[PDB]
Amino acid sequence: RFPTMDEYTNAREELIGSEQYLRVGGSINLNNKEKKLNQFILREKRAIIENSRLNKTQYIPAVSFFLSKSQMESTPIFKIIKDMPKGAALHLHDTASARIDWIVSNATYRDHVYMCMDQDNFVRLTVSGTGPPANSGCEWKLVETERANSGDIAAFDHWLKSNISLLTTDPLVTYPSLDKVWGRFDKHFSQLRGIIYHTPIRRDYYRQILEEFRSDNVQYVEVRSSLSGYYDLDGTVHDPEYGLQLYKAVTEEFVRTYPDFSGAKIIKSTARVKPNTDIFNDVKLSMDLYKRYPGFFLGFDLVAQEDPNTSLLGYIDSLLYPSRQNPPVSLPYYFHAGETNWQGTEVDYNLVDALLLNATRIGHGFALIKHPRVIELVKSRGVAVEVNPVSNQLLGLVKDLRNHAAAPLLAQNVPVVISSDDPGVWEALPMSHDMYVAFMDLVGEDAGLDVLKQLVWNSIQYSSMNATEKKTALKLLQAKWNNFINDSLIKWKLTNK
Amino acid sequence: VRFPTMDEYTNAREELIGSEQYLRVGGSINLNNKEKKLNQFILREKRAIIENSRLNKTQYIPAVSFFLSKSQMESTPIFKIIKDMPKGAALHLHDTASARIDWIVSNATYRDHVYMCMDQDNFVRLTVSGTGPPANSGCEWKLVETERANSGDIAAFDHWLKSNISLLTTDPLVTYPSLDKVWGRFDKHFSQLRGIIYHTPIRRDYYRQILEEFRSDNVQYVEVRSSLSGYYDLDGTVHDPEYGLQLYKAVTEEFVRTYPDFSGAKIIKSTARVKPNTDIFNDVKLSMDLYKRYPGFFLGFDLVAQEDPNTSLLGYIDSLLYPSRQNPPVSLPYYFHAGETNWQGTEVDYNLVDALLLNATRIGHGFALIKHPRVIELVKSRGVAVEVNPVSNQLLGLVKDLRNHAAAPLLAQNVPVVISSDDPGVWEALPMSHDMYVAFMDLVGEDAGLDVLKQLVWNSIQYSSMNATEKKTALKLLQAKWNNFINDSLIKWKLTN
Numbered sequence: 001r002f003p004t005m006d007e008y009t010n011a012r013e014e015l016i017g018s019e020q021y022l023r024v025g026g027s028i029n030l031n032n033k034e035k036k037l038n039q040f041i042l043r044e045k046r047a048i049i050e051n052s053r054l055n056k057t058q059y060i061p062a063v064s065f066f067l068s069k070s071q072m073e074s075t076p077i078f079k080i081i082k083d084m085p086k087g088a089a090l091h092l093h094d095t096a097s098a099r100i101d102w103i104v105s106n107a108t109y110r111d112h113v114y115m116c117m118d119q120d121n122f123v124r125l126t127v128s129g130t131g132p133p134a135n136s137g138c139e140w141k142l143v144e145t146e147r148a149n150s151g152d153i154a155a156f157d158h159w160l161k162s163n164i165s166l167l168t169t170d171p172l173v174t175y176p177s178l179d180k181v182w183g184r185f186d187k188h189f190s191q192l193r194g195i196i197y198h199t200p201i202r203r204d205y206y207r208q209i210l211e212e213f214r215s216d217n218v219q220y221v222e223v224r225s226s227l228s229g230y231y232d233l234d235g236t237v238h239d240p241e242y243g244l245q246l247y248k249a250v251t252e253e254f255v256r257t258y259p260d261f262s263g264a265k266i267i268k269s270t271a272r273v274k275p276n277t278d279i280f281n282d283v284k285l286s287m288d289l290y291k292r293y294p295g296f297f298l299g300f301d302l303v304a305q306e307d308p309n310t311s312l313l314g315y316i317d318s319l320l321y322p323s324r325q326n327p328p329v330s331l332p333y334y335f336h337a338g339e340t341n342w343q344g345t346e347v348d349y350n351l352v353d354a355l356l357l358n359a360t361r362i363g364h365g366f367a368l369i370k371h372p373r374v375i376e377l378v379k380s381r382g383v384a385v386e387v388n389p390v391s392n393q394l395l396g397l398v399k400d401l402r403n404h405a406a407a408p409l410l411a412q413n414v415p416v417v418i419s420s421d422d423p424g425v426w427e428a429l430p431m432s433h434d435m436y437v438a439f440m441d442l443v444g445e446d447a448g449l450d451v452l453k454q455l456v457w458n459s460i461q462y463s464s465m466n467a468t469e470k471k472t473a474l475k476l477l478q479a480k481w482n483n484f485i486n487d488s489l490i491k492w493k494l495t496n497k
Numbered sequence: 498v499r500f501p502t503m504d505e506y507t508n509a510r511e512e513l514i515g516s517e518q519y520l521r522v523g524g525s526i527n528l529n530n531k532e533k534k535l536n537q538f539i540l541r542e543k544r545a546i547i548e549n550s551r552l553n554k555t556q557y558i559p560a561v562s563f564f565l566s567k568s569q570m571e572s573t574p575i576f577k578i579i580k581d582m583p584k585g586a587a588l589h590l591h592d593t594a595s596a597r598i599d600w601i602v603s604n605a606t607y608r609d610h611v612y613m614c615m616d617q618d619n620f621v622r623l624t625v626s627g628t629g630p631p632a633n634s635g636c637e638w639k640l641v642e643t644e645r646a647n648s649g650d651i652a653a654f655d656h657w658l659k660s661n662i663s664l665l666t667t668d669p670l671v672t673y674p675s676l677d678k679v680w681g682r683f684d685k686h687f688s689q690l691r692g693i694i695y696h697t698p699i700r701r702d703y704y705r706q707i708l709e710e711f712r713s714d715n716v717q718y719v720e721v722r723s724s725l726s727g728y729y730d731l732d733g734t735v736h737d738p739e740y741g742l743q744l745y746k747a748v749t750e751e752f753v754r755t756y757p758d759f760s761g762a763k764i765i766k767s768t769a770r771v772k773p774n775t776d777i778f779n780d781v782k783l784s785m786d787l788y789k790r791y792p793g794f795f796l797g798f799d800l801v802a803q804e805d806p807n808t809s810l811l812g813y814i815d816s817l818l819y820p821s822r823q824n825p826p827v828s829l830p831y832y833f834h835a836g837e838t839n840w841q842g843t844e845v846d847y848n849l850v851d852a853l854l855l856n857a858t859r860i861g862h863g864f865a866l867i868k869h870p871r872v873i874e875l876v877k878s879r880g881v882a883v884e885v886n887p888v889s890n891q892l893l894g895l896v897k898d899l900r901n902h903a904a905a906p907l908l909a910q911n912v913p914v915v916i917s918s919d920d921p922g923v924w925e926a927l928p929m930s931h932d933m934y935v936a937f938m939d940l941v942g943e944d945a946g947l948d949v950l951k952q953l954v955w956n957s958i959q960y961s962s963m964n965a966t967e968k969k970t971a972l973k974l975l976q977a978k979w980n981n982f983i984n985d986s987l988i989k990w991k992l993t994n
């Protein structure tokens with residue numbers, strides 16, 4: 001009943017307003033300084049969207065990261081997000097979270113590093129103190145010699161980087177299927193496995209994760225790591241507790257050096273390709289490290305490609321073992337779950353088992369929007385979904401990022417944290433690229449700084465810090481946020497707006 | 498301990514999965530024993546194709562471009578069962594795009610006074626002129642009869658005409674790899690046929706071919722969008738919209754009298770949303786008048802043409818609110834295309850808010866609906882069926898992998914949905930069987946079978962605009978066709994025992 005345009009406007013704005021309040025960040029009340037920055041962001045967002053829509057050209061924030069990376073980095077919204085404190089990156093893999101450039105310019109300049117071209121014509125890297133490795137399907141050569149004989153060291157080093165990065169070409173073009181791009185992604189890890197498991201390189205690589213994340217204004221990380229098998233020049237192989245202690249010592253020194261950094265905690269990950277009887281041992285291992293490293297060791301996760309490998313149900317007696325002890329042991333789980341386009345299959349039904357197993361957070365949950373009951377359990381229990389949008393695009397779940405299945409989750413205020421997954425593999429920053437695409441593609445044109453602030457706060461509030469640590473971290477984050485707001489008003493000439 | 502045994506765990510697991518099954522489209526259907534026999538065969542076939550794709554790591558063909566999947570699906574049991582299955586109704590169709598290009602070629606371009614030219618973009622155009630060739634405005638018109646006779650190869654000439662008009666000659670996802678490019682090609686298709694298909698005897702016979710083709714795909718009823726206006730005779734006489742409506746009414750009545758196994762057709766007036774508000778106002782008043790004087794054949798009004806770059810519903814709001822604001826009010830039903838977009842928080846997807854505030858009877862596409870939880874509530878509460886056209890949404894740029902189709906989460910929440918084909922003539926689809934196949938294989942899960950199909954089929958009659966008497970009669974008819982389909986299928990697939 002709209003006799004005049006005012007009654008129609010009022011009902012229209014009431015319904016739209018209800019959705020805006022319901023979505024992520026909708027209950028935030030911005031202060032006056034925040035509002036001025038918010039209005040600039042919203043003007044910028046409308047300008048790029050309206051140009052795409054009305055001038056009938058592609059929306060760059062939603063195309064392949066290969067194409068959009070160099071375009072977004074010059075824009076004001078990206079520069080604001082780059083400067084913004086992120087809080088925490090809660091979904092990361094320890095052999096994929098520092099720069100390939102550091103592997104090349106630092107690790108492959110160390111003594112005793114070898115390279116070979118494998119039968120698929122990819123370079124592999126490893127360390128051997130005890131002579132060159134055996135020619136098992138590839139001929140190892142000392143990198144120092146190959147580089148010194150290249151006749152162009154800059155080109156040699158660039159070739160190493162180009163042969164290892166997944167962003168050398170557009171993966172959506174070069175590996176145009178799920179199985180092809182996962183073939184390339186699995187190959188990347190095989191290329192670096194040898195060098196990245198040598199103990200002093202692994203130690204320093206982990207330190208580089210912390211340096212790079214701090215440099216992108218991330219103050220805290222939770223990292224998945226397999227922990228085991230770091231090896232020395234003399235061939236000594238270390239156990240998982242040693243690997244955990246190695247990370248603990250690096251983290252403590254880093255936080256000593258940088259008290260503006262909250263620190264790190266570690267999740268043990270095992271590949272879901274192994275027999276149940278081996279997963280059982282890794283569950284027992286995790287129960288032990290959880291008891292003896294409280295507050296640094298968080299719990300357990302299963303990784304490797306979800307679709308063709310073993311389901312959570314395929315491991316259910318291992319995963320139920322802690323809860324079944326007398327007295328029960330509660331081993332926290334952080335399951336990767338539902339990282340798939342399938343529906344009604346044992347892959348997306350991993351989400352059901354993740355909830356039945358009391359997962360603390362869920363990795364990806366791309367299939368979650370197809371499961372209305374699992375959504376309601378996730379919301380009612382406060383189980384944060386770790387959303388990694390660049391990863392999901394480049395690794396084959398979606399092409400146009402406005403079709404990312406987390407957008408309907410955010411619209412319902414499902415608890416979500418943004419993370420980068422494997423940023424080093426495809427040359428992403430620790431958080432700013434993923435936060436930009438989440439901001440530009442997974443929420444709407446009228447969604448501004450309140451969404452960003454809520455996602456940032458979510459990454460601490462749904463971290464696995466204890467309550468006291470969260471309060472301390474939020475105090476530090478609030479000071480970072482206030483500086484970011486003031487700096488941004490000056491930088492974007494908004495102060496009198 | 499919550500799950501001390503496997504039976505305690507599977508009990509909880511199956512109750513949770515079962516409760517989601519009860520909540521999706523078709524989840525309340527109880528199949529009888531014959532239907533269960535066919536359902537078990539369908540589910541075995543569905544599991545075989547999905548598990549092969551998943552475990553043998555190869556593309557899921559039902560979800561790839563229609564250009565690639567069409568020939569592969571047609572040889573499979575599931576497609577052949579859907580082909581035989583009664584579809585109920587196609588509720589979302591456009592009258593100049595719902596019969597075969599082959600008929601335009603083999604019938605329409607063999608008629609007297611048909612001319613062709615190559616336009617400046619190098620596409621063939623077709624028109625009719627009773628007074629010699631038309632003015633050569635931007636192309637040189639030639640008589641088709643002469644060109645065909647001088648072609649030197651008549652079959653190749655006719656095949657070339659078809660190949661120059663169809664969007665499935667090449668894969669649109671490859672040849673027109675952006676929204677603007679493929680909508681450019683799509684707009685061009687209509688320009689190519691516009692002249693010939695607005696000539697009155699051709700337009701009449703083409704509309705008859707829509708009814709014959711849909712009947713042949715076991716569709717018993719259609720509701721069709723039509724602009725209704727501008728049909729023209731050999732001597733240049735141009736008819737008004739009421740004449741177009743009467744012409745369709747006569748063709749429909751003759752068809753139903755010939756084929757009692759066919760329920761019939763009703764018409765929705767469409768206007769392109771590139772026009773000034775003064776034009777839409779005139780077409781709203783025309784629709785008010787046709788609704789009053791052709792009850793039960795003229796249904797109401799819709800706005801068409803590409804949604805993203807053109808005028809919003811709010812841009813016409815004074816015209817659209819005019820019927821309700823009369824004294825006494827006149828209730829002009831609306832069937833708005835709405836939210837056919839990847840945009841979020843913009844003028845375009847917010848058309849969904851206005852469509853509901855204006856009391857739409859059904860909404861076309863609603864691709865953006867899953868991003869609008871408060872609109873979803875109204876759609877469910879009011880029983881506003883969403884017309885889902887999956888092949889159209891893929892080929893015209895909203896999605897690549899159809900498992901990412903935004904209607905899959907709608908179906909999982911039991912949003913009222915009907916499947917339709919939109920413009921099947923344009924890209925060589927069947928009236929319903931291809932779209933029902935991709936909906937069944939991509940938009941619901943591995944464990945969703947004959948109950949989903951049956952519900953979608955019943956929905957298309959239940960959410961039609963038939964009156965109470967017609968609907969009861971049509972549902973008895975549909976039940977009869979369905980029983981014959983189940984019995985025939987048990988024999989054909991050798992499922993009886």
Ligand SMILES: *[C@@H]1O[C@H](CO)[C@@H](O[C@@]2(O)O[C@H](CO)[C@@H](O)[C@H](O)[C@H]2NC(C)=O)[C@H](O)[C@H]1NC(C)=O
Binds near residue numbers: 122162163164168
């Ligand atoms: C990794 O490095 C390979 C060795 O250079 C490279 O091999 C070829 O394909 O690269 C050239 C094209 O860039 C081509 O001219 C050479 O003939 C190839 N070299 C050999 C020894 O076969 C691979 O393509 C690189 N792979 C990636 C993914 O970058």
Ligand SMILES: *[C@@H]1O[C@H](CO)[C@@H](O)[C@H](O)[C@H]1NC(C)=O
Binds near residue numbers: 002855
């Ligand atoms: C929509 O329908 C309601 C309920 O029938 C009615 O009261 C209202 O006037 C209608 N509004 C319009 C704009 O037609």
Ligand SMILES: *[C@@H]1O[C@H](CO)[C@@H](O)[C@H](O)[C@H]1NC(C)=O
Binds near residue numbers: 047051052
């Ligand atoms: C479209 O582009 C032109 C120039 O290329 C520009 O003037 C115009 O404002 C653009 N429109 C929008 C809405 O950005």
Ligand SMILES: *[C@@H]1O[C@H](CO)[C@@H](O)[C@H](O)[C@H]1NC(C)=O
Binds near residue numbers: 105106107109110204
């Ligand atoms: C690599 O990093 C280490 C430790 O961070 C540093 O001492 C060294 O200078 C760098 N380069 C190499 C080749 O070791």
Ligand SMILES: *[C@@H]1O[C@H](CO)[C@@H](O)[C@H](O)[C@H]1NC(C)=O
Binds near residue numbers: 498499
């Ligand atoms: C899950 O959590 C609930 C409440 O926290 C607890 O009672 C239950 O036993 C837990 N289940 C498992 C499998 O650990």
Ligand SMILES: *[C@@H]1O[C@H](CO)[C@@H](O)[C@H](O)[C@H]1NC(C)=O
Binds near residue numbers: 545548549550552553
């Ligand atoms: C995978 O393909 C092989 C043939 O190469 C076949 O034997 C096997 O059954 C397939 N597996 C599945 C799960 O379809």
Ligand SMILES: *[C@@H]1O[C@H](CO)[C@@H](O)[C@H](O)[C@H]1NC(C)=O
Binds near residue numbers: 603604605702
């Ligand atoms: C075209 O269809 C019309 C109308 O049914 C029919 O009379 C005519 O014979 C057809 N032309 C051809 C070549 O079949």
Ligand SMILES: *[C@@H]1O[C@H](CO)[C@@H](O)[C@H](O)[C@H]1NC(C)=O
Binds near residue numbers: 619660661
């Ligand atoms: C249409 O025909 C012309 C002339 O043969 C040809 O060059 C052109 O590529 C064709 N276009 C399409 C889209 O098939």
Ligand SMILES: [Zn+2]
Binds near residue numbers: 091092093336363421
């Ligand atoms: Zn991960």
Ligand SMILES: [Zn+2]
Binds near residue numbers: 589590591834861919
């Ligand atoms: Zn349509």
